[PDB]
Amino acid sequence: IRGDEVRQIAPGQTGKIADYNYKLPDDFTGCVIAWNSNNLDSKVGGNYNY
Amino acid sequence: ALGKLQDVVNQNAQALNTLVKQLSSNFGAISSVLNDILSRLDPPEAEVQI
């Protein structure tokens, strides 16, 4: 996901991707994991395959 | 003269009147009316007030 929208993906919270793209149950149990990925995924000149 | 019977009716009615009147108090929440509490706040923050 884009960096600015990590903190919305949590049970109970909304947001455009949180609403129409991926949403968690408001009573979810488990863990959410995220980290910076420019090093392995992003390419010079613009990565648009996502 | 008919004090005893009157007292019985008065006490019972005063108890019912208090029980109904207590539905107007928010008890530390932000509104007595349940509908406002459910609507104004999103479901996961509405539940604690409810």
How far apart, in whole angstroms, are the C-alpha atoms of residue B25 and residue B33?
A: 9
Please name which of A33, A28, A13, A29 lies closest in space to residue B44, comparing C-alpha atoms: A13
A-B interface: how many C-beta pairs under 8 angstroms? 8
- Characterise B5 by phi-psi region: left (phi > 0), alpha (psi -120 to 50), beta (else): alpha
Chain B residue with CA closest to A10: the answer is B44
Q: In this structure, are residues B42 and A18 in contact, taking their beta carbons and an 8 Å threshold? A: no
How far apart, in whole angstroms, are the C-alpha atoms of residue A19 and residue B46?
A: 19
Q: Please, which residues have CB within 8 angstroms of residue A5's CB and are 6 or more apart in sequence?
A: A15, A16, A17, A18
Task: Report how this structure was experimentally obtained.
Answer: cryo-EM
Resolution in A: 3.8
**Chain B residues interacting with chain A (CB cutoff of 8 angstroms):** 42-45
Sign of torsion over alpha carbons B35, B39, B43, B48:
negative
How far apart, in whole angstroms, are the C-alpha atoms of residue B11 and residue A1?
A: 65
For residue A36, the one-letter residue type is: N
| Percent of chain A as helix, strand, coil, to the nearest 5 | 15, 0, 85
Chain A residues in contact with B42 by the CB 8 A cut-off are 12, 14
Chain B residue with CA closest to A14: the answer is B42
How far apart, in whole angstroms, are the C-alpha atoms of residue B11 and residue B13?
A: 5
